[PDB]
Amino acid sequence: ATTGYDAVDDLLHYHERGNGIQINGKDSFSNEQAGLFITRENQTWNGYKVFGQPVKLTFSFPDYKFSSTNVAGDTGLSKFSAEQQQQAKLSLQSWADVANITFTEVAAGQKANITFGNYSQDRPGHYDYGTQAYAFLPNTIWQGQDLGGQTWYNVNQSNVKHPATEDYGRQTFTHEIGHALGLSHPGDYNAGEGDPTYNDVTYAEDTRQFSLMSYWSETNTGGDNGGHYAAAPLLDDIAAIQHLYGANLSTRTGDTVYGFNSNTGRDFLSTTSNSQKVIFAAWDAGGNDTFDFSGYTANQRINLNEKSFSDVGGLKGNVSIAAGVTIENAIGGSGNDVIVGNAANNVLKGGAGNDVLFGGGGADELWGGAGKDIFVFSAASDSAPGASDWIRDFQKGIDKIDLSFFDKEANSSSFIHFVDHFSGTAGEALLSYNASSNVTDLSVNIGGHQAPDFLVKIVGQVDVATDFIV
Ligand SMILES: [Ca+2]
Ligand SMILES: [Ca+2]
Ligand SMILES: [Ca+2]
Ligand SMILES: [Ca+2]
Ligand SMILES: [Ca+2]
Ligand SMILES: [Ca+2]
Ligand SMILES: [Ca+2]
Ligand SMILES: [Zn+2]
């Protein structure tokens, strides 16, 4: 039994977590739990244990003196270059997009909440090629001085010097800012302190697939970013930062397009070519939105449910949707895709290739596009009379309608069965073809009611002998 439903079922159970689950011999935490563990120090710019309140912060790029020594003892200091400043500002904005944080730049001489500076020596006249960067959480006091907000980077590392071309560099900026806002790593470990490895994590999801605060490879949980690094807060980072400063309800409230043809104005949410891969966790506060992954040629798996992961552009588990966000439409690429909608009305387009489309609840509009496509249904409510799904480009003898879930569940080959007239018997399915309108009605009486409780409208003719999977 290799059906469209199996592919759907697989994607729906991808990366399940929490509720007493255990992965890699470790406890699994839900998105909510992870967000809380990541902010376990309880420090915020609004005060200790003061959660959910908005904050206004200033930042700057001070003019550090080479010969000066910073609080951690590093020296060979320097001001961020123009390329570093530009990428740092993109990293700041990516945090402000998801939580109620306002960032305002002040002059180098003015006191600032968050600062950025380069270092190159661990002792005078001795270059350091072994460290990467560090930062102090809010309310870190030493000798009556508040160190919170300072972020320091080893400019001897090429990724730090050229964050615009080395994605690890941009990720490092986002990570350090995360610390400066109050987030810790998801587990108790820190560079220059023992020999930690993924085996030392507290919860399974402590990887770069779920949080950029993590040190561990996404491959530990089955992800694969193809050698790239996420530039902006990931799924669990969003939960963490929103716990501290609240969710930003004014972000992208209009109709937004993510991926190709994007109108987000965010480098990490957009792409203009098959070679440019995206890695992101989507936060969107309103509107009719679309995941457009039409320009990719790889086989993709797109799930529009909240907190779920998708396989986009040749990568694995690189795209996700934050808790409480509703993304309405999705467009597949020229590969053989699996596209799973949600309870809202979705517009799903498979594009070329042999796709599997699952609308779920609501009134969906499904387009298989070219290729041999399969439209899957598993509940009467997937296409209730009054709110029917529409299959707009069905090709008889080529595409298929998969109703296999039903007989499997009933464990009976005769539950779903075609008839020429209803009788009130549950399981009866009826096809009504209108040659003048080019529309075929597929009615099914799943519950055994007086009237059918499932009705799909199909543009095109359907051949009962070859077009169904039952
Ligand atoms: Ca939107
Ligand atoms: Ca929406
Ligand atoms: Ca496709
Ligand atoms: Ca197709
Ligand atoms: Ca539906
Ligand atoms: Ca739907
Ligand atoms: Ca097709
Ligand atoms: Zn860190």
**Residue 289 labeled ligand binder:** yes
The number of distinct structural domains making up the chain is: 2
94, 41 contact by CB (below 8 A): no
State the distance from the centre of ligand 1 to the C-alpha of 351, rounded, in angstroms. Answer: 23
Length of the chain, in residues: 470
Picking from 229, 248, 267, the residue at the C-terminal end of a domain is 248
Residues 304 and 235 in one domain: no
State the distance from the centre of ligand 3 to the C-alpha of 355, rounded, in angstroms. Answer: 5
Token pair of 130 as six digits: 């072994």
Token pair of 114 as six digits: 């968050």
Domain harbouring 300, CATH code:
2.150.10.10
Positive or negative, the CA dihedral 72, 136, 280, 100 is: negative
Question: Counting beta carbons within 10 angstroms of the beta carbon of residue 126, is it exposed (0 to 12), middle (13 to 18) or buried (19 or more)?
Answer: exposed
CA distance 62 to 152: 12
Picking from 213, 248, 283, the residue at the C-terminal end of a domain is 248
Residues 278 and 370 in one domain: yes
CA distance 257 to 234: 19
Picking from 227, 248, 269, the residue at the C-terminal end of a domain is 248
State the distance from the centre of ligand 2 to the C-alpha of 330, rounded, in angstroms. Answer: 12
Question: Counting beta carbons within 10 angstroms of the beta carbon of residue 457, is it exposed (0 to 12), middle (13 to 18) or buried (19 or more)?
Answer: middle
Please state how this structure was obtained.
X-ray
The residue segments making up the domain with residue 29 are: 17-248
> Which ligand number lies closest to the CA of residue 254?
1
CA distance 214 to 230: 12
**Residue 178 labeled ligand binder:** no
Residues 29 and 9 in one domain: no
Query: Pairing between strand 389-391 and 454-459?
Result: parallel
Residues 295 and 414 in one domain: yes
Residues 319 and 214 in one domain: no
> Which ligand number lies closest to the CA of residue 377?
5
Residues 239 and 360 in one domain: no
Residues 145 and 242 in one domain: yes
CA distance 391 to 430: 16
**Residue 326 labeled ligand binder:** yes
Residues 285 and 209 in one domain: no
> Which ligand number lies closest to the CA of residue 343?
6
Residues 244 and 255 in one domain: no
Residues 318 and 417 in one domain: yes
Neighbours of ion ligand 5 (CB under 5 A): 359, 362, 364, 382, 389
Q: 466-469: which pairs have CB atoms within 8 A and are 24 or more residues apart? A: 466/396, 466/397, 467/396, 467/397, 467/399, 467/400, 467/401, 468/400, 468/401, 468/402, 468/403, 469/3, 469/4, 469/374, 469/400, 469/401, 469/402, 469/403, 469/404
**Positions marked catalytic:** 176
> Which residues are bridge partners to 357 per DSSP?
339, 375
**Residue 337 labeled ligand binder:** yes
Domain harbouring 56, CATH code:
3.40.390.10
Convert the chain into a string of H (helix), E (strand) and C (coil). CCCHHHHHHHHHCCCCCCCCCEECCEECCCHHHHHHHHCCCCCCCCCCCCCCCCEEEEEECCCCCCCCECCCCCECCECCCHHHHHHHHHHHHHHHHHECEEEEECCCCCCCCEEEEEECEEECCEECCCCCEEECCCCCEECCEECCCEEEEECCCHHHHCCCCCHHHHHHHHHHHHHHHCCCCCCCCCCCCCCCCHHHCCCCCCCCCCCCCCCCCHHHHCCECCCCCCCCCCHHHHHHHHHHHCECCCCCCCCCEEECCCCCCCHHHECCCCCCCCCEEECCCCCCCEEECCCCCCCCEEECCCCCEEECCCCECCEEECCCCCCCEEECCCCCCEEECCCCCCEEECCCCCCEEECCCCCCEEECCCCCCEEECCCHHHHCCCCCEEECCCCCCCCEEECHHHHHHHCCCCCCEECCCCCCCCCEEEEEEECCCCEEEEEECCCCCCCCCEEEEEECCCCCCCCEEC
32, 323 contact by CB (below 8 A): yes
Residues 102 and 130 in one domain: yes
Residues 162 and 265 in one domain: no
